[PDB]
Design a protein around this ligand. Structure first.
Ligand SMILES: COc1cc(CNC(=O)CCCCCCNc2c3c(nc4cc(Cl)ccc24)C[C@H]2C=C(C)C[C@@H]3C2)ccc1O
Ligand SMILES: COc1cc(CNC(=O)CCCCCCNc2c3c(nc4cc(Cl)ccc24)C[C@H]2C=C(C)C[C@@H]3C2)ccc1O
Lengths: 532, 532
């Protein structure tokens, strides 16, 4: 009845789940695409053919095939991001949480997981949608999409491995929401897509792509934007990395058809095992198989589309965390450790900036170094560590996003910008990592509202504020409730460039988020590298 | 008797001058060279031929031919720098102040005036040597040398206008001191040369030049150093500017001999009137006729001599003023005024950096701008004004001197570094100009001891401390009197890089004078300009 829904593709049976003191409806693992397996590996997705009978949607689906982190086995701080279900190429499913009783036609939010386009799962604990759907009375969807070579191997000109098929996976789930969410009590005219990291970049890519714009109303971008340096490659570089993946696996490289035929014969773990080997440089915050600027999903270069206003004009809400860089330094740069303060020598600092800006020449590396070194105190291990942290986060997340913010606001219909700088009281990662890449998500999804997770009362109130900002923005295009007496999150404007902090303290309005370093990263350094 | 002195060139009769409550002997206007007139214009100096009878040395000599500032007619702040005697090409004379009674063989200090190599006189009120000679019981000499085209027209390969002849004028006065100062009670084995601005660059150039090294014992450099970007040119640029001087005056330009012959026919003021026209760029802190890197007075490039230790190894004392740049901005940059606070617009700020770094490409101008602009507050007219002030002083005086200081200290026998930042109580220049280029000289020469000049008691104390540091350094190679109870000015070392402030407060020791900006000016910007 409430749990039995007839969709355009067939019937689905959800399940009644507890949430806090109440209950909500959950429809877990609904298929939206044909399994992209066998001869369909690397191909564009195809709509799921209708089924007879009742699809049992009481259970999370498989996760897509991906690299699995084993750096800290058993450590909750890293395991919380690993697949918590069996991995399978049969992984194109979505999950829906619907308030009980079913609303008539309420706001829809569609979550797009991040993970550098090489990892991510819709089924992670931290993406459990019941708290946001319950508390804010929205219909919450989480989609999935192929990652790694399965989603983004790009042999442009081939229609068997064209590239971007993971983005087309996301679009197909959006098309499914457009076509079916009304049967779950959602309004298909009021859909907000939101995501973090590669999911935030993805959200911005759908803003850019003509083939995506009519499938959602407005957008939220968390710690990611479509113009980030790690988020796309040229057709030439995607082709180089695909050929190099074949070479690592002794594939016939004579032609696209032969290379593709060889790669379709490999077991999924065989591709994953060599995935990192195709990167052109020793680097951090760089991923092998990512969206390709192809002329079809993206009509022209991202910058030209941004300059001409060739993108969906709507309202956006977006922001960054204080220490986006620490996670990537922990995993890939010398001198960093989970169990120490990680004071960074001068030698390791220099090694770090080379890894963080792998595409720079020697003059470029000197410019970065000078911009972030205190030459009154250059042997300070704390300042060297924090300076590397700022380099990674500024270059890869904050300044690309601020470039997007400024370009979008010229043509958009409303921008709201945040800076999340709260370090959770129960964080299991050490102090030096600060406010980590990914660790705003738990507040967005209302995990502080769960008593046994041991957040403070102030953190529950912060999560509730953030959920209400997100859902109110999704409903109306404005995170603020009218006639309310709390402080108002102001519009970001071209002239005043205002943003807010998100933390447990009363709201402060600031202007020009990290403007000094982002002039360096968005204007001077690109000019220097283009001139040298 | 006391006033009658027989020198190797002939007898001189000095004069008894009052000084504070006492008297000392002055020998004013002694010739040390043949008049460099007629066919000797642009030529190396020749020793003064011996004369019969008594040279009346009771009167200041003429000043050399030079551009005369008429920007603020009658204003004491600018006219204190103008020739206070008749100008003449017959100007190669020196002045001596001798304690009374005549010492047996005491320390000698020789003053070399600055003025951009285009102006300067030994006879200015602020260079009056009687206060320092009386108070510190030294024999004080001030020399003269040809400036502008008359001293530094350079047509390399010609022996008629070889270049650097003003530096040879200085050398010949030093040779005269070496041969004759014993007859005035001075010890030719304890001669300190000191100078400000171009005089300070000159001092450093005598340290470098083999033909100068044996004519003095140690050296003091004030707000100038031999490697300053304004202090020398290549033989090719020197030749180009000499040929452009001829073109401005309708000279035959077919050979050195005809060009030189044409220029020797001109009245002195005809050369002066077109002097500034030969500069390659619109600029500030750039001067037309300066030393040439010639392979003779300087064996190789100044940077290679500094790197190899090819210079005199002795003790040096040197330093800079807090606002070296303001005088040059007042006279040559848009938005600056003697009679206003000179808040600088963004447009005028950008005009100023182009004038301040005239040799930079657009990439280099962007680099300077970013290094000195607060992009949270870029329309702040005070920050824009002070930033341009810092650019001029850092680029032209402070960071060249710090490069010299660090290179020299690797090989020398003792370095003492100061930062003069006292703004005089009776300054006639506006407050935005701060601590001006040239305005430590009056403290070095003891003017605050003259009650009529209306300095404070603390400024008299400051002048007495500085005169004692300078003379004790001249005497011993160390500004400090060991066994005394005063705060000790420490050696500058390669590792610790210590320096003191000079002002009316108790002594503060600091380290790494303006190290952050000087890394930009001495390492990064030249590498950027060399790549592009
Ligand atoms: C070849 O280069 C390297 C490759 C690797 C392989 N390992 C990795 O890239 C990182 C391990 C896989 C992802 C770890 C779990 N994912 C996390 C994620 C996030 N934040 C994390 C924060 C911390 Cl402190 C720890 C893990 C986070 C936030 C989101 C973004 C990403 C990219 C993955 C995932 C979701 C390690 C070192 C290297 O030098
Ligand atoms: C080619 O560019 C320009 C050229 C000129 C030509 N005029 C000048 O450069 C100024 C002419 C000399 C007038 C000042 C010389 N005296 C000063 C001197 C010093 N400090 C001064 C400080 C102030 Cl506030 C005022 C004068 C000072 C310190 C010493 C150093 C110099 C260069 C000359 C003299 C001694 C004017 C505007 C321009 O844009």
């Amino acid at each position: 009845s409430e749990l039995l829904v007839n969709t355009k593709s067939g019937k689905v049976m959800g399940t009644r789940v507890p949430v806090l003191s109440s209950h909500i409806s959950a429809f877990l693992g609904i298929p939206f695409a044909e399994p992209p397996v066998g001869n369909m590996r690397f191909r564009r997705p195809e709509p799921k053919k209708p089924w007879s009978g009742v699809w049992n949607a009481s259970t999370y689906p498989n996760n897509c095939q991906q690299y699995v982190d084993e750096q800290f086995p058993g450590f909750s701080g890293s395991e919380m991001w690993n697949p918590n279900r069996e991995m399978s190429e049969d992984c194109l499913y979505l999950n829906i949480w619907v308030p009980s009783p079913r609303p008539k036609s309420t706001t829809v939010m569609v979550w797009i997981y991040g993970g550098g386009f090489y990892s991510g799962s819709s089924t992670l604990d931290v993406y459990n949608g019941k708290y946001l759907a319950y508390t804010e009375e929205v219909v919450l969807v989480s989609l999935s999409y192929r990652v790694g070579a399965f989603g983004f191997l790009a042999l442009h000109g081939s229609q068997e491995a064209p590239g971007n098929v993971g983005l087309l996976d996301q679009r197909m789930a959006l098309q499914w929401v457009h076509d079916n969410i009304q049967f779950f009590g959602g309004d298909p005219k009021t859909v907000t897509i939101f995501g973090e990291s590669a999911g935030g970049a993805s959200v911005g890519m759908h803003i850019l792509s003509p083939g995506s714009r009519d499938l959602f109303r407005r957008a939220i971008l968390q710690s990611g934007s479509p113009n980030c340096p790690w988020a796309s490659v040229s057709v030439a570089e995607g082709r180089r990395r695909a050929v190099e993946l074949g070479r690592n696996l002794n594939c016939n490289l004579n032609s696209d058809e032969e290379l593709i035929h060889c790669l379709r014969e490999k077991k999924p773990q065989e591709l994953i095992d060599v995935e990192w080997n195709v990167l052109p440089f020793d680097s951090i915050f760089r991923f092998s198989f990512v969206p390709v600027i192809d002329g079809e999903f993206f009509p022209t270069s991202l910058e030209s589309m941004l300059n001409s206003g060739n993108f969906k004009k709507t309202q956006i809400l977006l922001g960054v965390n204080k220490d986006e860089g620490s996670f990537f330094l922990l995993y890939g740069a010398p001198g960093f450790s989970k169990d120490s303060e990680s004071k960074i020598s001068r030698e390791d600092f220099m090694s770090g900036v080379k890894l963080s800006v792998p595409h720079a020449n020697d003059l470029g590396l000197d410019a970065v170094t000078l911009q972030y070194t205190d030459w009154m105190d250059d042997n300070n291990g704390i300042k060297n560590r924090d300076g590397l942290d700022d380099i990674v986060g500024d270059h890869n997340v904050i300044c690309p996003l601020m470039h997007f913010v400024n370009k979008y606001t010229k043509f958009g219909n409303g921008t709201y910008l945040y800076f999340f700088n709260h370090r959770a009281s129960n964080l299991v990662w050490p102090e030096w990592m600060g406010v980590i890449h990914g660790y705003e998500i738990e507040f967005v999804f209302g995990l502080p509202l769960v008593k046994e997770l041991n957040y403070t009362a102030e953190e529950e109130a912060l999560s509730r504020r953030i959920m209400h900002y997100w859902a109110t923005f999704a409903k109306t295009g404005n995170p603020n409730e009218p006639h309310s007496q709390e402080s108002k999150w102001p519009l970001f404007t071209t002239k005043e460039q205002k943003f807010i902090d998100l933390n447990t303290e009363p709201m402060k309005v600031h202007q020009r988020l990290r403007v000094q370093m982002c002039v360096f990263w968005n204007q001077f350094l690109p000019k220097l590298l283009n001139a040298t």
